[PDB]
């Protein structure tokens, strides 16, 4: 049946290297290493008995520069013992991972057993063959109008959630997980916290438990107290689990990677620990590739019924799109959901500013077959009129309300009744995409039929 | 009137056709210039033949003297170490 067992029944001795040439920052350098690998995750034993894992990063002749995830602190040349496993970091995966809470490095903190591995998969993964990919054309009804109508999330989409520090991005992401469902017919959530607060992790865990998603969710929690070097591997572990459960098990998976800003801060700390290129704002020049190896593990593949949707939750430092984390994440991912501090202060939930938001995979996955015919034109017209509303609001602020034209007044009314009634939703209110489109048509019927220039004439005649 | 303007422009378009004929004549003049340049190419070649006739003559008059200098130099004993080596 399965021949992967035969290679498993092999014992490989590991060399214990007491020869530690030196240590600096998070990098511990070994000497007299016999044929070092390039990513051999080692088991570095401290003088006090603590065992920290580390993986080599640069291997000159008879030398290996190990970085330890838990930190060098306490490492001594005379007493530390480093054993080379001989293979890269491999997460023990199985179908029983669903319903278990793991630490940052995959060690189970659910007070339960060690995961009874069905396979050992490298956390770094491999690029999915573009010929083997399938373009995601199956719309997900997230239940929130700002994401279903204005934007649109497919099944294989990797649309993240751009947000600031204090915004309710966590409540939006938990809303999406508790409401995600195919428009025209469950999601095994894989949640990866990186440097989140205890309050955030507790909120996510309690939300999953109360909504019943905990029976099909595998948390990889890396709190702020957890070491800042294993934030690099936590999304890799969670995404390897998601890739398993999706491709090799045929389960649709929501991957929620919280605090990708914290992941990128860990990446910048690791890079600055070395003599890496500073990129922009101190982040490594390889940041794009690293974030690519994170995000691009999503998508569907040919012949396998599983799929992975990645909803990374970013934390923009100054609510700036131009910052490297949001810029690189927008360049890689297939859209973004822009949570706005302006709308949050205005009191709107969800505080989604749809103008910076986008979804590449709306183009296909919305249309006549997936949903009703008018959706694309309605979304385009809504974007145009929302922008006209914001511009007319700025013009009103500058030059008073009297100078505005009839079009500007209509657009201000549309802006008010669009932010107040369309974007705004309850935390537990889910709207069918057709209901959202009907509300959108009410908002467009605010206007006369002539000003809806982005609507095709046939759609406008059939839907006005 | 618009109709009268088109008729007047059509009358001026006849001059444009004459101008087009003048433009065609200019193209023919350019072809004649190229043809004349082709004749001038023979004239330039004839002028070049006059100059390079001396080039063949100037070479043969002083060829054997230059070879004597070239031969005596290639073979001349030039044995001297580098100044720094001393």
């Amino acid at each position: 049946n399965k021949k992967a067992v035969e290679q498993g029944f092999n014992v490989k001795p590991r060399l214990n290297y007491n020869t530690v040439s030196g240590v600096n920052g998070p990098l511990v350098i070994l000497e007299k290493v016999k044929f070092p690998r390039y990513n051999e995750i080692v088991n570095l034993t401290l003088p006090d008995g603590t065992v920290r894992q580390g993986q080599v990063l640069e291997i000159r002749g008879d030398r290996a520069i190990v970085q330890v995830f838990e930190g060098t602190s306490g490492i001594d040349v005379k007493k530390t013992t480093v054993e080379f496993t001989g293979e890269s970091l491999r997460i023990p995966v199985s179908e029983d991972m669903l319903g278990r809470i793991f630490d940052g490095s995959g060690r189970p903190i659910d007070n339960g057993p060690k995961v009874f591995a069905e396979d050992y998969l490298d956390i770094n993964g491999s690029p999915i063959n573009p010929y083997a990919r399938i373009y995601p054309e199956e719309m997900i009804s997230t239940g929130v109008s700002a994401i279903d109508t204005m934007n649109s999330i497919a099944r294989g989409q990797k649309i993240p959630i751009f947000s600031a520090s204090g915004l309710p991005h966590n409540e939006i992401a938990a809303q999406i997980c508790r409401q995600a469902g195919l428009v025209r017919p469950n999601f095994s959530i894989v949640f990866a916290a990186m440097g989140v607060n205890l309050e955030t992790a507790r909120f996510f865990k309690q939300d999953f438990e109360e909504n019943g998603s905990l029976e099909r969710t595998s948390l990889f929690l890396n709190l702020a107290n957890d070491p800042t070097i294993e934030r690099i591997i936590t999304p890799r572990l969670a995404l390897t689990t998601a890739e398993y459960l999706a491709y090799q098990t045929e389960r649709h998976v929501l991957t929620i990677l919280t605090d990708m800003s914290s992941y990128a801060d860990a990446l910048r700390e690791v890079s600055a620990a070395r003599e890496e290129v500073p990129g922009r704002r101190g982040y490594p020049g390889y940041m794009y590739t690293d974030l690519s190896t994170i995000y691009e593990r999503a998508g569907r593949v040919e012949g396998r019924n599983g799929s992975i949707t990645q909803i990374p939750i970013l934390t923009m430092p100054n609510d700036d799109i131009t910052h490297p984390i949001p810029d690189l994440t927008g360049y890689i991912t297939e859209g973004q959901i822009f949570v706005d501090r302006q709308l949050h202060n205005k009191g709107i939930y969800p505080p989604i500013n749809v103008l910076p938001s986008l979804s590449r995979l709306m183009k296909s996955a919305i249309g006549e077959g997936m949903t009703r015919k008018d959706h694309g034109d309605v979304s385009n017209q809504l974007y145009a009129k929302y922008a006209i509303g914001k511009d007319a609001a700025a013009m009103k602020a500058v030059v008073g309300e009297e100078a505005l034209s009839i079009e500007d007044k209509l657009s201000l009314e549309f802006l008010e009744k669009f932010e107040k009634t369309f974007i705004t939703q309850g935390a537990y209110e889910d709207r069918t995409v057709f209901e959202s489109l009907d509300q959108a048509w009410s908002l467009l019927r605010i206007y006369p039929k002539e000003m809806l220039n982005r609507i095709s004439p046939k759609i406008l005649d059939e839907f006005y | 009137q618009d109709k009268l303007k088109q008729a007047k422009t059509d009358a001026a378009k006849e001059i444009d056709s004459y101008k087009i004929q003048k433009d065609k004549e200019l193209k023919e003049f350019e072809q004649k210039n190229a043809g004349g340049v082709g004749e001038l190419e023979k004239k330039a070649e004839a002028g070049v033949q006059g100059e390079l006739a001396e080039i063949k003559k100037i070479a043969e008059k002083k060829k054997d003297d230059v070879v004597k200098i070239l031969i005596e130099t290639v073979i001349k004993p030039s044995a001297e170490v580098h100044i720094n080596a001393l």
Binding site: - | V66, I69, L70, T73, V74
Partner: protein, 56 residues
């Protein structure tokens, strides 16, 4: 033992050190090539009169 090509080389030697890493092509053909590339002003001055334009 590896002698120079009879057709290309007319005379001279190619002296090299013991390691054969540093060699000096002293063949008459190579020396004539150096003379041809380095005595063009003198050959031009001998063949043709000095240019009237080139003062100084």
């Amino acid at each position: 033992n590896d002698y120079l090509n009879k057709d290309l080389v007319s005379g001279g030697v190619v002296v090299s050190n013991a390691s054969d890493k540093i060699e000096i092509n002293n063949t008459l053909e190579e020396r004539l090539k150096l003379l041809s590339e380095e005595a063009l002003p003198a050959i031009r001055l001998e063949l043709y009169g000095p240019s009237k334009t080139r003062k100084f």
